[PDB]
Structure formats: C-alpha cells, structure tokens
From Swiss-Prot, chains A, B:
UniProt-annotated stretches for the region Required for reduction of TSC22D1 protein stability: 41-143
Localization annotation: Cytoplasm
Induction of expression: Down-regulated in response to enterovirus 71 (EV71) infection.
PANTHER family: TRANSLATIONALLY CONTROLLED TUMOR PROTEIN-RELATED, TRANSLATIONALLY-CONTROLLED TUMOR PROTEIN
Organism for this UniProt entry: Homo sapiens
Organ and tissue specificity: Found in several healthy and tumoral cells including erythrocytes, hepatocytes, macrophages, platelets, keratinocytes, erythroleukemia cells, gliomas, melanomas, hepatoblastomas, and lymphomas. It cannot be detected in kidney and renal cell carcinoma (RCC). Expressed in placenta and prostate.
Keyword Cell division recorded: no
Quaternary structure, from the entry: Homodimer. Interacts with STEAP3. Interacts with TSC22D1; interaction results in the destabilization of TSC22D1 protein.
Keyword list, A-Z: Calcium, Cytoplasm, Phosphoprotein
Identification of the protein by name: Translationally-controlled tumor protein
Functional summary from the UniProt entry: Involved in calcium binding and microtubule stabilization. Acts as a negative regulator of TSC22D1-mediated apoptosis, via interaction with and destabilization of TSC22D1 protein.
PROSITE patterns: TCTP_1, TCTP_2, TCTP_3
Length: 143, 143
C-alpha cells in the first residue's frame, strides 16, 4: 500500500485504496471518495481528517503562508520545482477563491495549523465525493 | 497504519482503518466494514478482494489443506499455537459448514487458490458487513 502524508505535519492524508489522478499539470492530486453510511466521506472517516472553516481573508493569509512553507521544502529537496509550483499554485489559489463556498476544508488529524488544507467537493450527481490535495505538499510512504 | 497480509499469497487483506475485533479465543480477526456506493463492502473494494464460491465439498477439501499450510508455517514460527490453531479451526469449520449459505467468500487480489478465504457476513441489523479472517494466517506489518 502507498500512504500519502502531509509534508509539513506528517499526518496520513489518504492512501492508494482510492482512485487518484493528477490534474493541473502535476500540481494536484484528485482523490475519488465514496459515500458510506454517520453518512460521510470514506476518505475523511478513514484517516480522521478534521473539518475546518476559513473566512476568505484567513484562507488568503493561510495559503500564502502555506505556499511559502512548501517553497521552503522544495528549496531544500527539489529546487527546480520551486518556480513551477509558485506559478501553478498562484493560478490555483485565485480559482479556489472564486468558488470558495463550493468547497469544504479538511486538515489532518494532528490539526497542525501549518498543515495542508484539503478541499472536498461533490460530483454533479451529488453523491460521489472527491478531494483536492497539493501534490508538492504530500510525501509518499511505501509499506 | 498497520497492513494485514495473507501469510500464504502475501496479498493485502485489510488495514487498521476499520474496526477490528479478536474473536473465537484469538483464532480469528473480525473486521467491520461499511456499505459503500454499485453497492458493496468498503473492505472488499479498498483492497481489491475477489469474491469466490465453493461447493460444501470443495470448501471442505480447500479448508483442510489450508490448515495444513498454516500448521506447517506455525511449526517453524510458534509451535505453541499449533494446538489451539487446529483445535479452534476444526471447530470453526463445523460452524462454517453448518451455516454455509449465510457466507460469501473472498480471496486476495492475486486469486491464489491456496491463499486465505475470508468470510463475509452481515450483522443482526442485516446492513452492517463484517469479514472473518484466520488470525494465524495473517502478518501485521507497519509503515
């Protein structure tokens, strides 16, 4: 099994028991969930993700801060990934802010305030959930 | 996370993301799943378990051979489990054969004809699925 952890907080975020597809040119992972019967998202239940909430202005403050943290990690492990990530994430942040109320927000079970914030959306059938993660803020652990 | 593997075919069978319970005096692990959306059992989908079928006669012959593979590995591992493994296992077979119709049967994704066969039943509420595994045929690795 492959487990994906938060690069900052080291929480487990999900694993390859779900369907995973890269999007936005390697910037993000889209993870397919399943609804299960408290009627919820298996990804969230399975990994004890905690739902959180932002005002738009606190997210803007948070996500710039988080982007700077990922820039730091990349600078010391993959310096070539820095300017694609900073470019791509800026493109992505401004779109996320547009649809801000279409997303729910989740953090790992450590509730580290410097951790990644995943976005939960639902497909148009209103039943299948999916979650968006910043791929550069994740670290794969085989076991 | 803890992954539970099939001692014989090395397939992944489940992980500790489910409620897991020891039953039958430490002979078996009972793993509680959730119904999930096609309608099925999260455990089965998450680890790509494969449903199989038996005649009672075929199951009888499969299961006694399975016990000899597990007796063998126990002889070299912990010979003090052989007495209570073959004891409970024999008692467990009679219970399964006596209620043969209430079960579905699942093997790891490699469909190894000699790997463990997990049983799928449902609770008195007829909605909650749970799967039965032979504990002595599992190895509990971490990450």
């Amino acid at each position: 099994m492959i487990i994906y952890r938060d690069l900052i907080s080291h929480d487990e975020m999900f694993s390859d028991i779900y369907k995973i597809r890269e999007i936005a040119d390697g910037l993000c992972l889209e993870v397919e969930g399943k609804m299960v019967s408290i009627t919820g998202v298996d990804i969230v239940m399975n990994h004890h993700l905690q739902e959180t909430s932002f005002t738009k202005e606190a997210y803007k403050k948070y996500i710039k801060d988080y982007m700077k943290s990922i820039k730091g990690k990349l600078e010391e492990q993959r310096p070539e990934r820095v300017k694609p990530f900073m470019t791509g994430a800026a493109e992505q942040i401004k779109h996320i802010l547009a649809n801000f109320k279409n997303y729910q927000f989740f953090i790992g079970e450590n509730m580290n305030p410097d951790g990644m914030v995943a976005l939960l959306d639902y497909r148009e059938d209103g039943v299948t959930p999916y979650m968006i993660f910043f791929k550069d803020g994740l670290e794969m652990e085989k076991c």
